[PDB]
Design an enzyme around this catalytic site. Structure first.
Site, PDB file in Angstrom:
ATOM      1  N   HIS A  10      17.332  32.424 -11.031  1.00 57.14           N
ATOM      2  CA  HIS A  10      18.493  32.440 -11.908  1.00 57.14           C
ATOM      3  C   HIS A  10      18.525  31.165 -12.743  1.00 57.14           C
ATOM      4  O   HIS A  10      17.697  30.262 -12.579  1.00 57.14           O
ATOM      5  CB  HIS A  10      19.793  32.602 -11.108  1.00 57.14           C
ATOM      6  N   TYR A  28      23.899  32.180 -13.200  1.00 59.48           N
ATOM      7  CA  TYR A  28      23.832  33.574 -13.611  1.00 59.48           C
ATOM      8  C   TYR A  28      22.387  34.035 -13.539  1.00 59.48           C
ATOM      9  O   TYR A  28      21.475  33.305 -13.937  1.00 59.48           O
ATOM     10  CB  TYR A  28      24.392  33.774 -15.027  1.00 59.48           C
ATOM     11  N   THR A  29      22.183  35.246 -13.016  1.00 57.20           N
ATOM     12  CA  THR A  29      20.847  35.807 -12.886  1.00 57.20           C
ATOM     13  C   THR A  29      20.578  36.744 -14.051  1.00 57.20           C
ATOM     14  O   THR A  29      21.263  37.770 -14.178  1.00 57.20           O
ATOM     15  CB  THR A  29      20.697  36.552 -11.558  1.00 57.20           C
ATOM     16  N   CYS A  39      23.202  41.097  -2.756  1.00 57.34           N
ATOM     17  CA  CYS A  39      23.939  40.275  -3.711  1.00 57.34           C
ATOM     18  C   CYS A  39      25.299  40.901  -3.975  1.00 57.34           C
ATOM     19  O   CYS A  39      25.383  42.039  -4.442  1.00 57.34           O
ATOM     20  CB  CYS A  39      23.173  40.101  -5.021  1.00 57.34           C
TER      21      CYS A  39
HETATM   22  C1  LIG Z   1      23.264  32.714  -7.366  1.00 61.47           C
HETATM   23  C2  LIG Z   1      24.417  33.271  -8.160  1.00 61.47           C
HETATM   24  C3  LIG Z   1      24.175  34.231  -9.139  1.00 61.47           C
HETATM   25  C4  LIG Z   1      25.219  34.769  -9.893  1.00 61.47           C
HETATM   26  N1  LIG Z   1      24.927  35.723 -10.856  1.00 61.47           N
HETATM   27  C5  LIG Z   1      25.919  36.217 -11.552  1.00 61.47           C
HETATM   28  C6  LIG Z   1      25.617  37.219 -12.558  1.00 61.47           C
HETATM   29  O1  LIG Z   1      24.500  37.656 -12.829  1.00 61.47           O
HETATM   30  N2  LIG Z   1      26.730  37.679 -13.239  1.00 61.47           N
HETATM   31  C7  LIG Z   1      28.038  37.265 -13.036  1.00 61.47           C
HETATM   32  O2  LIG Z   1      28.938  37.767 -13.718  1.00 61.47           O
HETATM   33  N3  LIG Z   1      28.309  36.324 -12.086  1.00 61.47           N
HETATM   34  C8  LIG Z   1      27.297  35.835 -11.388  1.00 61.47           C
HETATM   35  N4  LIG Z   1      27.570  34.902 -10.418  1.00 61.47           N
HETATM   36  C9  LIG Z   1      28.956  34.444 -10.263  1.00 61.47           C
HETATM   37  C10 LIG Z   1      29.277  33.290 -11.213  1.00 61.47           C
HETATM   38  O3  LIG Z   1      28.472  32.152 -10.899  1.00 61.47           O
HETATM   39  C11 LIG Z   1      30.759  32.921 -11.119  1.00 61.47           C
HETATM   40  O4  LIG Z   1      31.158  32.818  -9.757  1.00 61.47           O
HETATM   41  C12 LIG Z   1      31.700  33.862 -11.875  1.00 61.47           C
HETATM   42  O5  LIG Z   1      31.202  34.063 -13.199  1.00 61.47           O
HETATM   43  C13 LIG Z   1      33.114  33.328 -11.938  1.00 61.47           C
HETATM   44  O6  LIG Z   1      33.108  32.073 -12.652  1.00 61.47           O
HETATM   45  P1  LIG Z   1      34.317  31.648 -13.571  1.00 61.47           P
HETATM   46  O7  LIG Z   1      34.196  30.167 -13.947  1.00 61.47           O
HETATM   47  O8  LIG Z   1      34.454  32.569 -14.717  1.00 61.47           O
HETATM   48  O9  LIG Z   1      35.559  31.803 -12.602  1.00 61.47           O
HETATM   49  P2  LIG Z   1      36.248  30.627 -11.793  1.00 61.47           P
HETATM   50  O10 LIG Z   1      36.962  29.717 -12.725  1.00 61.47           O
HETATM   51  O11 LIG Z   1      35.167  29.959 -10.935  1.00 61.47           O
HETATM   52  O12 LIG Z   1      37.289  31.432 -10.925  1.00 61.47           O
HETATM   53  C14 LIG Z   1      37.615  31.036  -9.578  1.00 61.47           C
HETATM   54  C15 LIG Z   1      37.654  32.278  -8.725  1.00 61.47           C
HETATM   55  O13 LIG Z   1      38.972  32.864  -8.773  1.00 61.47           O
HETATM   56  C16 LIG Z   1      38.878  34.275  -8.648  1.00 61.47           C
HETATM   57  N5  LIG Z   1      39.546  34.889  -9.793  1.00 61.47           N
HETATM   58  C17 LIG Z   1      39.986  34.264 -10.929  1.00 61.47           C
HETATM   59  N6  LIG Z   1      40.548  35.068 -11.799  1.00 61.47           N
HETATM   60  C18 LIG Z   1      40.471  36.313 -11.193  1.00 61.47           C
HETATM   61  C19 LIG Z   1      40.891  37.595 -11.598  1.00 61.47           C
HETATM   62  N7  LIG Z   1      41.498  37.846 -12.761  1.00 61.47           N
HETATM   63  N8  LIG Z   1      40.661  38.626 -10.754  1.00 61.47           N
HETATM   64  C20 LIG Z   1      40.053  38.382  -9.590  1.00 61.47           C
HETATM   65  N9  LIG Z   1      39.614  37.220  -9.102  1.00 61.47           N
HETATM   66  C21 LIG Z   1      39.854  36.218  -9.956  1.00 61.47           C
HETATM   67  C22 LIG Z   1      37.389  34.626  -8.533  1.00 61.47           C
HETATM   68  O14 LIG Z   1      37.021  34.778  -7.166  1.00 61.47           O
HETATM   69  C23 LIG Z   1      36.729  33.402  -9.170  1.00 61.47           C
HETATM   70  O15 LIG Z   1      35.400  33.196  -8.704  1.00 61.47           O
HETATM   71  C24 LIG Z   1      26.530  34.328  -9.655  1.00 61.47           C
HETATM   72  C25 LIG Z   1      26.776  33.371  -8.677  1.00 61.47           C
HETATM   73  C26 LIG Z   1      25.732  32.837  -7.926  1.00 61.47           C
HETATM   74  C27 LIG Z   1      26.031  31.799  -6.875  1.00 61.47           C
END
Ligand SMILES: Cc1cc2nc3c(=O)[nH]c(=O)nc-3n(C[C@H](O)[C@H](O)[C@H](O)COP(=O)(O)OP(=O)(O)OC[C@H]3O[C@@H](n4cnc5c(N)ncnc54)[C@H](O)[C@@H]3O)c2cc1C
Length: 270
Positions: free
Chosen positions: A47, A63-64, A243
């Site tokens: 990723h 992101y992958t 995953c």
């Molecule tokens: C190895 C790896 C690979 C990944 N690959 C992908 C990928 O291919 N595609 C992808 O989309 N993501 C992927 N993710 C997840 C990604 O890294 C993030 O966790 C995700 O995009 C959320 O980030 P954010 O900053 O937008 O949310 P953050 O600001 O980090 O939000 C905090 C958390 O609050 C919760 N949350 C906030 N708002 C809401 C809501 N409206 N409804 C429900 N829950 C909520 C969620 O659990 C969220 O993670 C991957 C993660 C890892 C570790």
């Protein structure tokens, strides 16, 4: 050929060139590489990291991609957007996903990588580092089990695409794909196209938290019987890839893999 991610310590700003609505909350984001002849430089299964400053915070998220080094000039990501004013306990939403959602065509964001403990080296050979510290261990398998939820499909599709494009790769993939409703089944056309073209090497099954009236697949969380019927049998000593959200791994996947007989040493969580 020119490699985009030359060093894992360098952040490369890439421009958004396309954005496709995949579902009500999920999109495919396509970014241009530095030249049309460039490739990403991403071993199969790994990723990248996106980084940006958002409201005084330095937000970094992995992101992958679903694309590969065969794709010249672009990289494809599939991202679920955590919208604000949508969930009671999380009213502010997610930082990175909403930032990506607001990006206009041409806007840039920094990429960095590759990263990850698993690399598919072809012909059934998986290189898996037991932890972030050790050398990769090579084990050749004849079949691979695959459990994905939501955007957890992206590493799985990376491996599926790599296997199916090689006619001399006889590894058989069994995918169990779990989502909330039928409209949440990401990349269904691509999955079913691959299944209809390579049915001997690709088995595909869905389950839904809530199914429609006419539904030929599964309903409910991933359970013991779905794993028994739609993943390769433990006697084949397959590799089982996972995953999805950590709670779905913890409560729906690991206990039921134990129930069926898949040992932890033959399982891997992305
Ligand atoms: C190895 C790896 C690979 C990944 N690959 C992908 C990928 O291919 N595609 C992808 O989309 N993501 C992927 N993710 C997840 C990604 O890294 C993030 O966790 C995700 O995009 C959320 O980030 P954010 O900053 O937008 O949310 P953050 O600001 O980090 O939000 C905090 C958390 O609050 C919760 N949350 C906030 N708002 C809401 C809501 N409206 N409804 C429900 N829950 C909520 C969620 O659990 C969220 O993670 C991957 C993660 C890892 C570790």
């Amino acid at each position: 050929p020119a490699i985009t991610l030359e060093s894992p310590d360098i952040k490369y700003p890439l421009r958004l060139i396309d954005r496709e609505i995949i579902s009500h909350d999920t999109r495919r984001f396509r970014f241009a590489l530095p030249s049309p002849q460039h490739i990403l430089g991403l071993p199969v299964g790994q990723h990248i990291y996106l980084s940006a400053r958002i409201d005084g915070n330095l937000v970094v998220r992995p992101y992958t991609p679903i694309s590969s080094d065969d794709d010249k000039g672009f990289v494809d990501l599939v991202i679920k957007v955590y919208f604000k004013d949508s969930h009671p306990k999380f009213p502010a939403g997610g930082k990175m996903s909403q930032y990506l959602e607001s990006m206009q065509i041409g806007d840039t964001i920094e990429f960095r990588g590759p990263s990850g403990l698993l690399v598919y080296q072809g012909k059934g050979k998986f290189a898996i580092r037991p932890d972030k510290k050790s050398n990769p261990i090579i084990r050749t398998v004849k079949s691979v089990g695959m459990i994905a939820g939501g955007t957890g499909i992206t590493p799985m599709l990376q491996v599926i695409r790599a296997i199916m494009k090689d006619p001399d790769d006889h590894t058989v993939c069994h995918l169990l794909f779990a989502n909330q409703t039928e409209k949440d089944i990401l990349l269904r056309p691509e999955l079913e196209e691959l299944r209809n073209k390579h049915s001997a090497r690709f088995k595909l099954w869905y389950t839904l938290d809530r199914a429609p009236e006419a539904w030929d697949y599964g309903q409910g969380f991933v359970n013991e019987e779905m794993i028994r019927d739609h993943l390769p049998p433990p006697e084949e000593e397959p590799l089982v890839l996972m995953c999805g959200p950590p709670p779905m791994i913890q409560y729906a996947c690991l206990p039921n893999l134990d129930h069926v007989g898949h040992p932890t040493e033959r399982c891997f969580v992305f």
